[PDB]
Design a protein around this ligand. Structure first.
Ligand SMILES: CCOC(=O)CN1C(=O)COc2ccccc21
Ligand SMILES: CCOC(=O)CN1C(=O)COc2ccccc21
Ligand SMILES: CCOC(=O)CN1C(=O)COc2ccccc21
Ligand SMILES: CCOC(=O)CN1C(=O)COc2ccccc21
Ligand SMILES: CCOC(=O)CN1C(=O)COc2ccccc21
Ligand SMILES: CCOC(=O)CN1C(=O)COc2ccccc21
Lengths: 219, 219, 219, 219, 219, 219
């Protein structure tokens, strides 16, 4: 990554053994559960494109997902090149060349080039551009690997309302419902999918009930 | 987080793998037992709003609780906006814009904006404002998930008085009794709920007995 | 805590994940065995009152003990206020206000106030004052939770003298005998409580025998 | 390794216990699965040739592989010497001598010589030259130890298409197919090797189907 | 401990959680096996007397040994006071007072006094003086707790000579034989205590045989 | 060890708990397998003679090996004294005295003396001299403890050629064959010791076959 030292200048630091192991272990334990994505983003704080490729390449399983991710990255690289074409022909001596899509993705750029860009005044933030493409790709994989439709999450006859609600919002998160839909489902599908006794109590609460209010009512 | 370097200026540092893992593990092991809240506060020392969202988003279960927390955050954001409206229309060039509720909660502000605020002279402490809203939300969840009324904590016939007292104050803490109530319950409900033999001994101690005095008496 | 940086000025540092976990784990494994107290003191090196409250609040069980500790803290705070009353009425602008008992205990003082005091020239050592009150409280709890009188530690008929001595001094430590009593018990109760064969050998050694001498004699 | 200190000059630092243990453990757990190679590269960030030999020499098993690697290293050293012959006869006093192949591989050069080269202006990057030879060697070993031809990866009759795809691309990676072949196999051998029901569905999708499209189709 | 910072002045640093736990765990796993003593010395590198007392006080078992150690410490303190008596009567204002035995042992001196001494030019090395007394005490305990005389270590009839030699020198180390005795026992008691077949072979090797030579002979 | 600080001067640092534990654990798990020696060398990067003795003294078993090592060290110390005799009679005031063999081995020199030597301009590298003697000793122990002659490593009738080759080179490494012998054994004893089917195939490959070529042939 690039960090500020103890005196305030921006320099390269090697990726740590603790960071490398944290990422490999979270993929082993959680696969593509939705909370893996904010973990990746945090573990890659300050990352160069080289570091981002190291993190992805250290994963041993999930090679169908890693091939889908490559396909997303190539699509974003091709849209960058459409928006930001670069001059062909030789580099001005001692000067920096502009990055192409494959330079952002770390496949045709050196570590020194990447440092040059990220520490320019002002920075050309190649690590953050690439991280956004990767996270776009990862969210597609999360949605693909979500096993269950929200239509099929219904409260069991003896199931505590809290446990049902946990299943419901776990599923909405993996299915990638917008926050608007999440805030709205509370007056609709969450009630419809409740068991008969709780459905009666919720029906009588009326409209405008908060989630806290619904949870206390069916406690 | 924002920290002072080894030379004394306030700068951004990436959240550590050890901090990320500590928080995820404490939620896995303890859920919303009351001691999780002081742990969250300590683990988020110096946090930006970005860091606070990372901590909350890295939690994989408990999605009913995370939706209730969002609802609390939105309520506090809306009260901030009532108290501190911001000018509409374009930013003064090179200057800082004032934060709205959703800027405090990290949803409409960038990391650079958050650093600008927190390191202004004097600071606009957006990380500490947001942390207070989150902890307000978390304490509601603790109270909701408390399984047992203090009325139902009574000493068993062969139960050591110390073990009964531990159950009693564990329950008062989750039910969120004020410290006044905790200090007061010692002359009342703690005695009423004791077994017959200990109740007799405590009755005869009189009023004004400390907890230490009651514990020695029923030892 | 407050530490000296790499250049020698006294500044605040966040409490570490390793410190937080060390303390919670030692309470889980050892409860109020006497060696927990020197561990608390060491783990709280350089602590502010805020840090001391964090350590105590992160404990999940033992709520009878934590309520007794609050009672001790309130008693010491009330004696501080008797010895060191503070001026009522408004703060001198930009100047520091004197601490009251509840300011020392971190309940009515801010982190910034606590830093101001501890880094004044010369320091008003609010962290060390509070730590002394806490340790006074903790030693009472250790004595209360000691399960066995020294009168009831007697050597078994086939019990190795070394194992008996370990039981004896483990018990004296929890019962909070002074070092004078510990040094003295060697010529008295340690012999009286020995089994018949070892008691005979120790009787014949005479007075003035060291512990080493008694241990070799009954080996 | 060579690192920049907190003030920005390039200096030697000892290899850490955490780095040493990370590498030995990844070889114990994964052997020569393809993801071990990006792990080696990352763990050896900033390495001298001395450090690279330490990492390889700390491996206890896999001595057939370590002998094959020595053979690769000797071949690259001999090609370096063909391209870059060095002057025979005595060193200019106080000056640096040019590196031979065995100097790059750390067998005939001292640590001080290696530091001299790597920190020259501009650097003679002996650590990175050697690391490239080692990784060339390691990729040969990965290919040798790949147990299964891509021809023999076929979808079972009840095997989820995702699990089949994971097996397919895991195998292509160990067999060292180029990225062109990986991107191309999707319109060919991946379909041919599918079970009858999925093969029918994929045949009807037509040409140009992405991997994501094929995975959804056979879900 | 006292350490040199990153800029070269001698300052106090808090004892670490890793150091505290390392020591408690080595006593739990090894008790007073002889290799515990070099471990204590290393773990207490740079220690103040306060730190040395913390390490000893964090031990929970072995209270017969900790009482014997106190007795040794008191004997060394009393010999220091015989050699280095201190002036009675009031301290010169702002100046340092000379240490007594109980000041060295940390029982009547403050942390600030101990820092003053250890960082004086030239230092009065109170931490190293106390550590020597402690190690004197610890070596007595090791000798006391050694379970077996060297006379009773004899090679079994099918016991590999190497395993016998390991038992022999493990025992000599706990019994605290001088290095002269260890170097000498090789021509004597090591042969006498060997089984009949190996004794014959060793007898015929003659005098002056190294340990390596004896081990190869009976292999 | 001696390290360069963050500002570039050479100073003493205490040996770490992580280094101490790493070494003790590798001896517990691996004993004197050959890969323990490069691990010792790396873990002792920058070591003083004091640190080297700490590492060796913290080992609890293997006391026959530790006595053999002492014997090697004494032999190297005696050859140093033959090559580099020192002046008898008093030290020049404030100046440094020259090291004798037992000063190099840390038995008659202080820590301060060792630092003086290692940080002289130019250094008298007492830590590296001693480490070379120790490693000479350790390699003798590895050879002594090697359980099997290369003559007795022969391929089983159903044993995969790769597994046989791993056994063969594991044994050559412990027996301490030179690299010339290792490179040469491939055209000779490795073939002779192969099973009948593989021996036939290897015989027909001819001379000059690489190890890779032989491994593919018998795959
Ligand atoms: C413009 C092409 O960009 C890449 O293929 C970048 N990349 C790698 O280099 C290696 O690892 C990956 C794994 C998953 C997705 C992408 C990559
Ligand atoms: C004004 C809206 O503020 C949020 O929703 C902030 N927030 C997030 O961004 C993401 O994670 C959360 C989890 C639980 C509660 C709040 C959030
Ligand atoms: C003057 C009142 O001081 C306190 O109650 C300080 N205190 C806390 O704030 C919170 O945690 C505690 C736990 C056990 C004992 C005391 C406290
Ligand atoms: C020009 C000869 O270069 C080497 O043999 C370097 N080398 C070593 O020194 C020791 O460990 C190795 C293990 C596997 C491959 C190579 C090496
Ligand atoms: C002159 C008296 O010196 C001590 O008693 C020092 N001391 C302690 O303070 C506390 O812990 C110990 C444990 C074992 C031995 C000695 C001590
Ligand atoms: C000139 C004599 O040098 C030593 O005996 C150094 N030495 C020690 O001090 C203590 O530990 C050892 C263990 C194994 C071998 C040597 C040592």
């Amino acid at each position: 990554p690039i960090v500020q030292n103890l005196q305030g200048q921006m320099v390269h630091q090697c990726i740590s053994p603790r960071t490398l192991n944290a990422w490999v272990k979270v993929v082993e334990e959680k696969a593509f559960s939705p909370e893996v994505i904010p973990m990746f983003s945090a573990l890659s704080c300050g990352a160069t494109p080289q570091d981002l490729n190291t993190m992805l390449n250290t994963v041993g399983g999930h090679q169908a997902a890693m091939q889908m991710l490559k396909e997303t990255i190539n699509e974003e690289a091709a849209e960058w090149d459409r928006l930001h074409p670069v001059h062909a022909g030789p580099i001005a001596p001692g000067q920096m060349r502009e990055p192409r899509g494959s330079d952002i993705a770390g496949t045709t750029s050196t570590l020194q080039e990447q440092i040059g860009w990220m520490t320019h005044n002002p920075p050309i933030p190649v690590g953050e551009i690439y991280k956004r493409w990767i996270i776009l790709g990862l969210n597609k994989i999360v949605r693909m690997y979500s096993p269950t439709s929200i239509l099929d999450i219904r409260q069991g006859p003896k199931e505590p309302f809290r446990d049902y609600v946990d299943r419901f919002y776990k599923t909405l998160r993996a299915e990638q419902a917008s926050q608007e839909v999440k805030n709205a489902a509370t007056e609709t599908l969450l009630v419809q999918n409740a068991n008969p006794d709780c459905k009666t109590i919720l029906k009588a609460l009326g409209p405008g009930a908060t989630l806290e209010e619904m949870m206390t009512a069916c406690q």
